[PDB]
Amino acid sequence: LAAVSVDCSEYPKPACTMEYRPLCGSDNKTYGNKCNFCNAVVESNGTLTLSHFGKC
Amino acid sequence: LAAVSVDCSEYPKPACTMEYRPLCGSDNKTYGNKCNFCNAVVESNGTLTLSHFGKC
Known about the structure:
Two copies of one chain form a homodimer.
Chain A: E1 2-5, E2 23-25, E3 30-31, H1 34-42, E4 50-53
Antiparallel strand pairs in A: 2-3, 2-4
């Protein structure tokens, strides 16, 4: 429909610095920040997606 | 599928200024603007999403 999304295209970033803004993956883990989230979302291939913004 | 989305990643913004562009959350409330929407979308953890662009 409409949605509220994270863009992960220009990830993975080897080096990247990121207040504190966590995410909560499919997996029920709280991803520190977006660079933590979207890299693992590439190194996951499919078995990670965003269950929501914030901590779990 | 395809969708028309709002990116909330680099929220919450403590200070932020935002014409007038409302959103309409899951909850059937009209969120003044995007900074109003995406902060509450973090401080909601999951129980807020976008039902559509515009006022309700």
